[PDB]
């Protein structure tokens, strides 16, 4: 009742059918905005219909896996909606990825054809049927809306996480687009910004979150991907109302404080992908009042998003919870024996409902490993995320981290969030990184990575930690950094964790 009472009937009309009605009712309404390009609904829909026929002309049935590797551009939208209209699933690929993985993904996917932007056809080596995305040849002159043989059960896209391909059905996606639109209506006046790379589930929210309310989609340029001030221009420029973010990228974004202004139209900021720090919540509101900040959580196998937490301006959360599930979502936290956990007790987070992904692509031993028919969903399967979490008194779920990370060293399994809170209390320390490292078996030495341009010797560092807490949790090693190293995913990972020094 408090967490999973999420039943809300939604229209089963497909996403492209909704796109078609919007072009038929208000053709000239501005639909896409890429720099000087301001494509209308009628202009967008027809170009989509062009590319849809040539896919149907090349044997695209439903559940057909169409591969894509077109970086951010108007061609991406044309490719996606057309592959959707054709009936097959669109499979994004990063053009900057090594060739061994593109060959692996294609071989394991068994895709029938690939649509790639003009430069990336050679990068798609030995691809059976390649219709160059930019070339006019791949577009048929017919602009009549093709027949929608796609059902809500057929695949819409295949998102790759030896990587695995997450097969997701159409109706699973519709449930979230209508779900987000109810909570965060992206109406005509309102707009969305495309910041997250489309090799990640987050982008699919931006790509489609603007159709339910007849809004517009601002195709932010790949040049301005990691550049917050360039992103910041798009907010005031096009009057962006919805932005998807990650706890990492938003802190630089936050660093441009209240001194900058004029962003009246911005409504929501949706952070996802990582556990949000506590200081980030109040620091945002001073920088940007009259704006609603939301913490989002969703694994790729759970159709983009799964949970949301509305952060009130006048409230400060000690652990920032990933919140309650979306409409028609049901989340369960079970222990290693497959029974539901009570409030506060950690366990493996599991999502269930109509919005669960079809499974992993041609990896059935893994699909049945992770999508297990659980008795708590009346026999229907749940996705075992491998993430540790717990409920709050009000029911909002709290993200705790990956499994087998917390160690009962010296007899304590307490989280490391309280440690990260005391480092930033000093103005000389900027952020916080607390990661345990095992250099050899039986020799586990945790390391701390902070950002302080002022010099801190080895002797002084251990005593700084004494003024915080007793001598029993002090990191065995300390590392000096000038800027935090991150991976290409725009995220903080333990793989980019180097050895200690100084």
């Amino acid at each position: 009742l408090r967490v999973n009472d999420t039943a809300k009937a939604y229209p089963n009309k497909l996403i492209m059918s909704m796109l078609e009605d919007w072009a038929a009712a208000t053709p000239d309404k501005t639909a896409l905005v890429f720099r000087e390009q301001r494509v209308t609904y009628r202009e967008l829909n027809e170009r989509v219909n062009q590319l849809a026929h040539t896919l149907r002309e090349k044997g695209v049935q439903p559940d057909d896996l169409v591969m894509l590797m077109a970086e951010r551009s108007v061609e991406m939208m044309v490719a996606i909606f057309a592959v959707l209209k054709a009936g097959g699933a669109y499979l994004p690929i990063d053009p900057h990825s090594p060739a061994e993985r593109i060959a692996y993904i294609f071989a394991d996917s068994g895709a029938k054809l690939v649509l790639a932007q003009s430069p990336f056809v050679e990068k798609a080596s030995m691809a059976e049927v390649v219709l160059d995305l930019n070339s006019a040849s791949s577009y048929a002159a017919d602009t009549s809306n093709p027949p929608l043989v796609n059902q809500p059960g057929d695949l819409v896209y295949v998102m790759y996480t030896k990587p695995k391909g997450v097969m997701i059905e159409h109706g699973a996606l519709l449930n979230v687009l209508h779900g987000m639109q109810d909570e965060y209506p992206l109406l005509q006046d309102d707009a969305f910004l495309l910041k997250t790379t489309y090799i990640f589930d987050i982008s699919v929210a931006e790509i489609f979150g603007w159709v339910p309310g007849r809004g517009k989609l601002v195709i932010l340029e790949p040049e301005a991907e990691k550049n917050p001030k360039a992103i910041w221009q798009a907010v005031v420029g096009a009057g962006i109302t919805h932005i998807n973010f990650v706890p990492s990228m938003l802190i630089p974004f936050v660093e441009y404080l209240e001194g900058r202004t004029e962003a009246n139209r911005l409504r929501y900021i949706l952070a996802c992908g990582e556990a949000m720090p506590d200081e980030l919540v109040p620091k945002v509101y001073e920088v940007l009042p009259e704006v609603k900040l939301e913490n989002i959580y969703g694994p790729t196998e759970a159709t983009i998003y799964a949970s949301r937490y509305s952060l009130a301006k006048g409230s400060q959360e000690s652990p920032v919870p990933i919140g309650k599930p979306l409409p028609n979502y049901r989340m369960y936290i079970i222990n290693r024996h497959g029974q539901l956990q009570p409030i506060g007790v950690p366990g493996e987070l599991c999502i269930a409902g109509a919005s669960l992904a079809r499974g992993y692509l041609n990896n059935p031993a893994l699909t049945e490993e992770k999508f297990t028919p659980h008795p708590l969903e009346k026999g229907e399967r749940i996705y075992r995320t491998g993430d540790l979490a717990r409920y709050r008194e009000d029911g909002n779920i709290e993200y705790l981290g990956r499994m087998d990370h917390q160690v009962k060293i010296r007899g304590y399994r307490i989280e490391l969030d309280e440690i990260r809170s005391k480092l930033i209390q000093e103005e000389t320390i900027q952020d916080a990184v607390v990661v345990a490292r095992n250099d050899q078996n039986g020799q586990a030495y945790l390391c701390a990575y902070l950002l302080s341009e002022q010099e801190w010797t080895v002797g002084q560092l251990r005593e700084l930690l004494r003024r915080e807490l007793p001598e029993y949790m002090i990191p065995a090693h300390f590392v000096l950094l000038k800027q935090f190293p991150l991976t290409a995913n725009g995220k903080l990972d333990r793989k980019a964790l180097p050895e200690p020094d100084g």
């Binding site: 010797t457 080895v458 002797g459 251990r462 004494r466 003024r467 007793p470 002090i474 065995a476 100084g502």
Partner: protein, 432 residues
Amino acid sequence: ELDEQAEYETSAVEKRMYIIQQQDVESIAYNVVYTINFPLTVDTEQIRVALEQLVLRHEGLRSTYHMRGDEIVKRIVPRAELSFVRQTGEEESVQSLLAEQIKPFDLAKAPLLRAGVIETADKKVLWFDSHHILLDGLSKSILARELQALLGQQVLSPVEKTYKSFARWQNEWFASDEYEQQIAYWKTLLQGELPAVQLPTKKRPPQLTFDGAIQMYRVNPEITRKLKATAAKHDLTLYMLMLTIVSIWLSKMNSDSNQVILGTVTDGRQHPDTRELLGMFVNTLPLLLSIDHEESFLHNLQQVKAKLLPALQNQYVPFDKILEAARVKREGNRHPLFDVMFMMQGAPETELESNMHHINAGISKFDLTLEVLERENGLNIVFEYNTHLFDEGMILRMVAQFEHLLLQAVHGLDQQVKRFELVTEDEKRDLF
């Protein structure tokens, strides 16, 4: 001399060092760092080879401490491999190269000593790092002496005794009547209420911190000779004189308290057959001194002498035992019996010992340590102070106050101590 047992008992002071280090294994607080500036003409491999002989020569450099149940036990390793790193750098990077060398010690791993040579454009700087459980004050003088002899192409007589033999002798001596009479003196002395020394510090950390720094006040050779002449004139040692000046200084900064308490260090070489042994012998003593501000400086010198001699006569009771007899334990943000340490070591025995610069790696074992060192016919009054308790400006003032007070004492032997001003004239002007 003990027979070649597989394992030997450790002394009470060895037990204390081990206990302290095992309570904070990451602490470099007890690392004993020294540097020696050698000319480029010296062969660095000769230094390396000479140090390796001293490793083979002294069991202390091959001693390993272990925990057998509840007994702290010593094992003697026959041969140990010495870490010897070679680095080339510049004077601008010497401290950076040294900080990387200051690493924690595994008390269960021998040798408890690391060394290296940092070669620059002008000098070949020999550096070595030992632990205090092995290298006390006199041991370093023994090390510098014998390294000089070997580098000077001389031979050394074989070591007659071993540290483990002294360890057993002192352990058995703890059961004698003499010890029971010495600890009885401390029981009667430390039974009542003890004075507290309050210093103008910042808010104390809830727990003991050890971040510190050093300021050095140079007493020129001229004043130093007059001090020595005064002390000799009235049957006093320079140590007794400096101790009384520090006691008055602490007294005046403590609202002219009648009683002051401060720690000191005795050589601890109880058995005369230990003057040539490498090891930690020095014992820590608490000094309960009384300052009669109405009496002259000379009268306080006699009172300090009268109080000091009983302490020096019962100096061989381990500090941990003195804590037991006093019903006091290590608790809270204060150090057990005293907060001010007064160390004093005579002039270097050799030229090589004179060029040894004690490197403080930002460590303060107490709130404040005054180490008067006779160097170059002067007095290097090192103010080792806790950086969390005193800013750099706060110590420079206290140092200036101590200098001003010392200059009044040498010029006012027969003057009443109450007439000596502590606040300087520049502090009065700025106050106005």
